Paper text:
CI2 is a small single domain protein of 64 residues, which has been extensively used as a model to understand key concepts of protein folding and stability. L49 and I57 are both part of the folding nucleus in CI2 and very important for the stability of the folded state of CI232. Here, we have applied an efficient in-cell assay in E. coli to select variants of the barley chymotrypsin inhibitor 2 with increased stability. We, therefore, determined the crystal structures of all four CI2 variants in the wild-type to L49I/I57V double mutant cycle.
Still, we found two variants, L49I/I57V and D55G, that are significantly stabilized relative to wild-type CI2. For L49I/I57V we find that there is a strong positive synergistic effect between the two substitutions and this variant is stabilized by 5.1 kJ mol−1 more than the sum of the individual effects of the two single variants. Overall, the structures of L49I, I57V and L49I/I57V are highly similar to the structure of the wild-type with RMSDs for the backbone of 0.16, 0.45 and 0.17 Å. Around the mutated residues the structural changes are minimal. The Val at position 57 in I57V and L49I/I57V superimpose, except for the missing δ1 methyl group, with the Ile at position 57 in the wild-type and L49I. In the structure of the double mutant, however, we observe that the Ile at position 49 is found in two alternative conformations. The minor conformation, accounting for roughly 30% of the electron density, has a conformation similar to that seen in L49I. In the major conformation that accounts of the remaining 70% of the electron density, the γ2 methyl is rotated approximately 120° and points towards the position where the δ1 methyl group of the Ile at position 57 would be in the wild-type structure. Although we see small structural changes in the structure compared with the other structures in the mutant cycle, the presence of two distinct conformations of the Ile at position 49 in the double mutant could point to effects of conformational entropy or conformational changes also contributing.
Numbering used by the authors:
A (entry chain A), B (entry chain A), C (entry chain A), D (entry chain A), E (entry chain A), F (entry chain A), ...: 1 to 64
Write the structure that this text describes.
Amino acid sequence: MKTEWPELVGKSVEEAKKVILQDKPEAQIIVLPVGTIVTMEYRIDRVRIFVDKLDNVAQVPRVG
Amino acid sequence: MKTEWPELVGKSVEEAKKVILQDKPEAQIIVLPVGTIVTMEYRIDRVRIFVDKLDNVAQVPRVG
Amino acid sequence: MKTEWPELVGKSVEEAKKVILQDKPEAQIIVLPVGTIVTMEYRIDRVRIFVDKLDNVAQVPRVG
Amino acid sequence: MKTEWPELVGKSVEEAKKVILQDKPEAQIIVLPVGTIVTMEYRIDRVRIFVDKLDNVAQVPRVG
Amino acid sequence: MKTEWPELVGKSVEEAKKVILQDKPEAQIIVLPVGTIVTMEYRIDRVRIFVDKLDNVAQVPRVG
Amino acid sequence: MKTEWPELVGKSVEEAKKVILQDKPEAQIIVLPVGTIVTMEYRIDRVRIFVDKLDNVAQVPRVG
Amino acid sequence: MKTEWPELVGKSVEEAKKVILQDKPEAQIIVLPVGTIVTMEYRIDRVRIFVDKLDNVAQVPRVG
Amino acid sequence: MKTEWPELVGKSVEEAKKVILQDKPEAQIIVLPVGTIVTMEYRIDRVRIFVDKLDNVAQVPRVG
Amino acid sequence: MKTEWPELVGKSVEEAKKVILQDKPEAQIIVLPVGTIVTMEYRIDRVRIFVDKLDNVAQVPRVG
Amino acid sequence: MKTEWPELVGKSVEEAKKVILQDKPEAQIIVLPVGTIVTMEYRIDRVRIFVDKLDNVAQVPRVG
Amino acid sequence: MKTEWPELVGKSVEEAKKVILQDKPEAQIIVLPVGTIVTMEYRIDRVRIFVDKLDNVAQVPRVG
Amino acid sequence: MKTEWPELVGKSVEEAKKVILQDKPEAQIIVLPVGTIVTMEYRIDRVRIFVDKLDNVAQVPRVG
């Protein structure tokens, strides 16, 4: 099962969403600033994308 | 009593509000950024929705 | 002496202000985001309202 | 020496500035959000005003 | 060597920049909100200016 | 291998990006506010730029 | 249903536990330092006691 | 698959460990203070237990 | 009504407690480290004392 | 090059150190509480181990 | 008026206290860990000393 | 001028102090936990050492 998207570091939110949904059609994509504190439980259908000030992907997106 | 809405993860605030009010007509719906610190008491009529940068539901909304 | 306004959870800032001033004509109403850190002293004429992202009342307003 | 302005709680920044400068013509007035962390040294000519989301004075302004 | 600018407390960013560059032509001027956390190393050509909500200088600018 | 860009302190994001990509054509450039908390792993192709309120480079950009 | 114990402010943990269990025999009593950050869900059988440096009750214990 | 242990709220670490290992023989049990910030990835064999000042279980232990 | 004890800055907890109880026989005295975050409501019978590493009073004790 | 030690989650510091040094004889092993904030640069010879209240490994140790 | 003690950086608490009281007989000396958050008002008779893990003076003690 | 001690990562406080004082006889050595927040000014005679739970050097010691 695909769980990580290193290839998306540096790319835009739009490009990330497109790629993640090709790979994971059920993905529930959540867009948060880097450094956001995240007390969450694990959701196998969720993919969190941490973005910079310019809404580029700053860290490897991972399922959960 | 309905207490959680896992089906709303990833959906918009508007869609969440609509669904929560169908299920819980008395709901007092509060919209906060993920990571907001929450020193609150329990209110059975309140539903907090934690949203991402795009005002999508990021975490399962729960009564309280 | 009226000290709390549970009836205002979920309502707008405008509606809250109107109700608080009917009940407490001398009120000095302060509007802050939920989670704001509050190292304050007690002021009997002040009412702090903690609001969500949509400027709705998120927590019971209390004198102080 | 005037050091505090309790009478300004709840008032606007503009009204606060006007009153503080009548009382303290040399005042260097600094406007910060409530909860801002303040590791400062003491300046006798400075007056910090802590304001709410609506740029109303939320706490008693004090010299320093 | 000039290392501090107490005379700039309360002044605008534009006035501060002008004065700092007259005094220190090589200055690399960085503008940050008060309370920003600053884990930095020492740079002799840098001057950080901490500003309030109105982009006025809130604290004595210092080299480093 | 070039790992740091001290020469970019004080410069704009646009100038920084241009210089970093001349030096490191594969760079994945991420733009964050100073003070952002950064729990990241090491990526040799990434360069994080920490910027001030005016989107000037505030700290030496480094690979990772 | 008893939900708060104002009478226990200032008392020891031992005295608090004794009183809470007389009033609420099923209580699951949790002892935390004041200021502890509490991202919890509501448990009707739990009573959190916030204590000072001397393990005295510092704030009104409440169910949840 | 057992994922939560509500029955352990209020119990000691020793009793929790015993019960979790009966239910989940492969469990890797981690004991942390309530409020600890937890930027972790999901591990299906891990169970985190959040404890109070007296090393009693303060919150429902969950796999991850 | 006595509300503040400036005379106790620098004194020990034991001396502070003695003086506060002479002045305020009903006082519920709470001892916390400086910097403790305090999201509390106002209690007219409570006096919080903020202490240093040596359990000396570091800040003016005040009712509330 | 070995960069991660998932097999050490849940084990003691002593066992972790032994295993990491078998795999990486030059390792500079650093032991920190979970949640410690880590503004560090990348060191290829360092391995940070994040431990729980009982000095067990709480998270996968990684080079850097 | 003596307001700072640069000569005490690196010295013990005992040596600092001795020197500060020679210079300032009325000093109310408060000993805090580095990084302690300090929302205080200005007291001309107080001297705060910020100490390291070994109770050595880590930063220049200053009146206030 | 020696400004950094990479060779001391992983070593004890005692060994670090010995080496730093051989290299810098005037050093004022300050020992702090990793993650300590450090709002300091630059002191050319100071060397801060950030240590882990076992009082080993966790990060490169640097003058300032």
